[PDB]
Design a protein around this ligand. Structure first.
Ligand SMILES: C=CC[C@@H]1/C=C(\C)C[C@H](C)C[C@H](OC)[C@H]2O[C@@](O)(C(=O)C(=O)N3CCCC[C@H]3C(=O)O[C@H](/C(C)=C/[C@@H]3CC[C@@H](O)[C@H](OC)C3)[C@H](C)[C@@H](O)CC1=O)[C@H](C)C[C@@H]2OC
Ligand SMILES: [Ca+2]
Ligand SMILES: [Ca+2]
Ligand SMILES: [Ca+2]
Ligand SMILES: [Ca+2]
Ligand SMILES: [Fe+3]
Ligand SMILES: [Zn+2]
Lengths: 107, 800
């Protein structure tokens, strides 16, 4: 259950590939519009690698469908999110998440 | 004879001194034992609550029986009534009822595992009631009869030589046989029978095939066949070269610190991750991840270095440090600047992380330490009550008065009988002593509780001077450095300030000059940045248009500082109400979660009492109407607001909600229709108010313009269309939150009004400390990642 809505277009030619590192800014908010985390609060990007399950399967699938420079709104249903367990202290159980993510660079 | 005369006098002072040593040690040893159980949340357990039942049962015997038992010896008389006489043996024979039965329950409980929970509560109550029912016979028979010594009338408690019923007559004759049977034979048989069966069950299938299974892998992982696993050989698995915690876990496995892991060390570590592993030990492995030097305590610099590995470059060195000091300070219940395992429990007790540290193995082999105490407590009981029962048996079998040298035999017996009583009393003050010396877990807790008996919360004497006026410089500096206040003083600021708000009218009268400020939304470090722009609050009048909380992480500092500033300057600082000062929104947003983490739930309630007293609007120099939101369809004149009842949570509809939620239209000043009010789709309630609505309201009340807030602006202000009647901008929005939500990157503004001159002063964002989402600490933040990583390593090491 991954839904991608385009906010600002990118170059449309460059895509993340397996084995390399994605550098993104992300803004994670619940389905009700409440924000809980964002890298822009820290003024540094978030680095993760494709294919090594460093992030939840919902976030990884959306990032692979984004182009370099593209910024899009992602929907993370609980099946491709923390699910029934949630995350202690942040995410209520069975919560759907919305991520606003901008791809800056790929290595 | 002649023997008993000197023996009784010899033990008259010996018995009373021992009872004093029992009293002093018993009252402090047993009470501290209870204080440990409830303070430490890991110590609750199920086998550790029956031990607390032993201490409570013995404490009652110590505080009642022992003192009056001493006064029997010294006075040789009963200065008390008959009711007390039936209370002395009833409790003394009841306390040993709890002691005997608890040791039986403790023995059954430990064999249960090898073969406060809901089923624990029935055990405690059933033990106590059953014990008391069997102490009734003592209470029935004791009374003051049949002594008269040389004309002196003395009161002495004893068992009745003649009983009301024959059942008590049987009890009186075989009293020692009943004491020896139910209180000595019954526990020692049950405790030993289950321990003998426990040893046999543990011995069988202990090694089993599992140790053979892990041995197959251990040789395989040992490439050089040196009999021990090196760090380089652990790096040989491709799946572990990307795990950041492999170097830490190898440190736990390497017990002796020689840098390499042998077979015995390998087997011990895997046992800790079994499906049958208990809660208290899996939390200890997670504890040992952070504890680098294995000194039992997590330090400030060691917690940072561990986190720096897992975080990576996702955070700065300053930001990761800042949350570490806050985590240490909030979790340090001892003020020693470092975290112990008991404090580590209080943070992560309910996180259920232990349910993730699971692999497919068995044979925890940890039943040694916990069961040593149970067998030691039974050991202490057996060696204290053995001499007393042995004296009575000696009387029954070997004593005969017909023997010529009868006096010599009674001489040895009466010396031992007095000793047997003294040792029997020692068991009431011995159980805490044995626990402190046997079990490491109780030993560490006892050391902290007794021997050991910025993070500094400001005290009431410091924030207030002798006149009751808070000192802003002290409060500002402490709050700016992440400091907090005492729980009482936090309530004092909120309550004292709220009273000043309670006396002030719904519609304020504010005279020029004055500074108008918009939303703050918990941006405390942006709030001080506001004050130099507008001027010092002492000599500059400020008007805040609402929104003091939510959307930030320093909401409580904004509340405390403004309410503190309200008390010091009631007539030059004016606070108005925004839509976030209600129970509806703070439940939805983070203000409530902030109050729980930062001060308490009780401070949050105090805020809502003050948030109800906040004024709704102000009249600025008789030309400007100042309000958080905008106009209302149900308000046409200013006196309408004066009639409202503001001391309540705002309703979902009505004039008050329309004041605190209404927004101007997107095409304000260029509306396609002439409708005055339309439904507000953005907010979900209240109304949109258009340009015709504003101009009519201004003219009808002889007003010039309207100052509002509650809408984010890139420049911090927005000058709308100028009114045709006056040539002045009809509506002004002031937004004084720079870099709102840290994602907008906007500017903030404050409005200066003086000499009929309109001035806008802007300022940008300021650096502020970093809080994790929902104000959590790094232990809650990281343990879901620690528990996942160590499980990823262990499954890759074993299962392959
Ligand atoms: C210090 C050590 C911890 C280490 C922390 C960091 C490197 C800092 C990094 C910015 C995380 C943020 O810390 C401020 C914070 O980001 C959130 O707020 C968030 O917006 C979020 O959902 N993100 C972050 C962006 C990528 C998607 C997702 C995520 O993949 O997060 C991952 C995640 C939670 C995986 C879980 C782990 C538990 C498993 O059970 C579950 O398996 C299903 C999967 C994060 C990146 C982990 O890989 C790495 C860590 O946890 C989480 C709501 C909670 C998380 O803090 C934990
Ligand atoms: Ca080797
Ligand atoms: Ca070793
Ligand atoms: Ca240490
Ligand atoms: Ca401490
Ligand atoms: Fe606001
Ligand atoms: Zn508002």
């Amino acid at each position: 259950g991954v839904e991608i809505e385009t906010i600002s277009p990118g170059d449309g030619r460059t895509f993340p590939k397996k084995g390399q590192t994605c550098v993104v800014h992300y803004t994670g908010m619940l389905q009700n519009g409440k924000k809980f985390d964002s890298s822009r609060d820290r003024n540094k990007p978030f680095k993760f690698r494709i294919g090594k399950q460093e992030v939840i399967k919902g976030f990884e699938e959306g990032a692979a469908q984004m182009s370099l420079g593209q910024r899009a709104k992602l929907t993370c249903t609980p099946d491709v999110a923390y699910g029934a367990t949630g995350h202690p202290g942040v995410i209520p159980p069975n919560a759907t998440l919305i991520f606003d993510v901008e791809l800056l660079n790929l290595e | 004879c002649q023997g008993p005369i000197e023996i009784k006098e010899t033990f008259k002072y010996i018995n009373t001194v021992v009872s004093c040593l029992v009293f002093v040690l018993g009252i402090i040893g047993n009470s501290t034992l209870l204080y440990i159980i409830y303070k430490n949340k890991c110590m609750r357990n199920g086998p550790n609550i029956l031990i607390a039942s032993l201490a409570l049962g013995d404490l009652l015997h110590i505080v009642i029986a022992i003192p009056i038992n001493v006064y029997k010896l010294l006075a040789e008389d009963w200065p008390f009534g008959a009711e007390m006489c039936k209370l002395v043996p009833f409790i003394q024979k009841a306390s040993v009822g709890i002691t005997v039965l608890s040791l039986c329950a403790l023995s059954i409980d430990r064999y249960r595992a090898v073969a406060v929970p809901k089923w624990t509560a029935v055990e405690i109550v059933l033990i106590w009631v059953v014990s008391v029912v069997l102490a009734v016979p003592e209470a029935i028979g004791f009374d003051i009869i049949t002594m008269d010594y040389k004309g002196s009338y003395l009161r002495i408690c004893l068992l009745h030589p003649v009983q009301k019923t024959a059942f008590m007559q049987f009890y009186a004759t075989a009293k020692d046989w009943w004491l020896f049977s139910f209180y000595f034979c019954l526990p020692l048989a049950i405790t030993a029978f289950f321990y003998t069966l426990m040893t046999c069950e543990m011995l069988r299938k202990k090694d089993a095939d599992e140790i053979k299974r892990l041995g197959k892998r251990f040789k395989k992982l040992d490439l050089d066949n040196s009999g021990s696993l090196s760090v380089e050989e652990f790096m040989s698995l491709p799946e572990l070269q990307q795990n950041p915690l492999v170097q830490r876990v190898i440190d736990i496995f390497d017990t002796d610190g020689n840098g390499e892991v042998d077979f015995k060390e390998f087997i011990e570590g895997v046992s800790q991750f079994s499906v049958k592993g208990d809660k208290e030990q899996k939390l200890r492995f997670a504890f040992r991840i952070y504890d680098m030097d294995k000194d039992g305590y997590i330090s400030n610099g060691e917690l940072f270095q561990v986190l720096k590995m897992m975080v990576g470059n996702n955070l700065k060195d300053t930001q990761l440090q800042q949350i570490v000091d806050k985590t240490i300070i909030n979790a340090d219940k001892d003020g020693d600047g470092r975290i112990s395992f008991e404090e580590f429990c209080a943070v992560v007790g309910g996180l259920d992380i232990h349910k993730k540290m699971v692999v497919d193995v068995d044979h925890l082999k940890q039943r040694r330490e916990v069961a040593k105490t149970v067998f030691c407590l039974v050991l202490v009981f057996a060696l204290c009550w053995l001499p007393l029962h042995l004296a009575r048996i000696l009387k029954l079998t070997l004593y005969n008065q017909n023997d010529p040298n009868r006096c010599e035999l009674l001489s040895f017996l009466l010396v031992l009988d007095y000793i047997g009583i003294n040792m029997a009393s020692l068991n009431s003050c011995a159980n805490p002593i044995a626990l402190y010396l046997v079990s490491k877990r109780f030993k560490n807790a006892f050391k902290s509780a007794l021997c050991c008996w910025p993070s500094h919360r400001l005290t009431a004497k410091e924030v207030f001077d002798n006149d009751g006026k808070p000192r802003v410089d002290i409060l500002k500096a402490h709050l700016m450095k992440e400091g907090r206040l005492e729980e009482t003083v936090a309530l004092r600021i909120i309550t004292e300030g709220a009273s000043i708000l309670r006396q002030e009218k719904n519609l304020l009268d504010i005279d020029a000059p004055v500074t108008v400020c918009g939303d703050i939304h918990g941006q405390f470090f942006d709030l001080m940045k506001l004050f130099e722009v507008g001027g010092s609050p002492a000599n500059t009048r400020y008007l805040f248009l609402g929104d003091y909380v939510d959307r930030g992480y320093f909401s409580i500092e904004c509340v405390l500082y403004l309410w503190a500033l309200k008390i010091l300057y009631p007539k030059t600082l004016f606070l108005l109400r925004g839509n976030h000062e209600c129970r509806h929104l703070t439940e939805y947003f983070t203000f409530k979660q902030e109050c729980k983490i930062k001060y308490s739930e009780r401070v949050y309630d105090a805020c809502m009492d003050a948030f109800d007293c906040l004024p709704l609007a102000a009249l600025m120099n008789q030309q400007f109407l100042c309000v958080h939101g905008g106009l209302s369809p149900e308000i046409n004149t200013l006196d309408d607001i004066r009639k409202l009842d503001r001391f309540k949570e705002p309703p979902a509809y009505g004039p008050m909600c329309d004041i605190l939620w209404s927004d101007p239209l997107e095409d304000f000043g260029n509306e396609k229709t002439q409708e005055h009010f339309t439904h507000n789709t953005v907010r979900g309630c209240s109304y949109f108010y258009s340009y015709p609505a504003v101009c009519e309201f201004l003219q009808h009340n002889n007003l010039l313009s309207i100052l509002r807030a509650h809408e984010a602006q890139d420049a911090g202000y927005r000058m709308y269309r100028k009114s045709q009647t006056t040539g002045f901008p009809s509506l002004i929005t002031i937004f004084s939150a720079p870099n709102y939500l840290d994602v907008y990157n906007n500017k903030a503004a404050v409005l200066k009004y003086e000499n009929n001159v309109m001035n806008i002063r802007q300022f940008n964002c300021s650096p502020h400390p970093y809080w994790l989402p929902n104000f959590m600490d790094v232990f809650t933040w990281s343990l879901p990642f620690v528990g996942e990583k160590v499980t990823e390593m262990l499954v890759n090491v074993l299962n392959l």
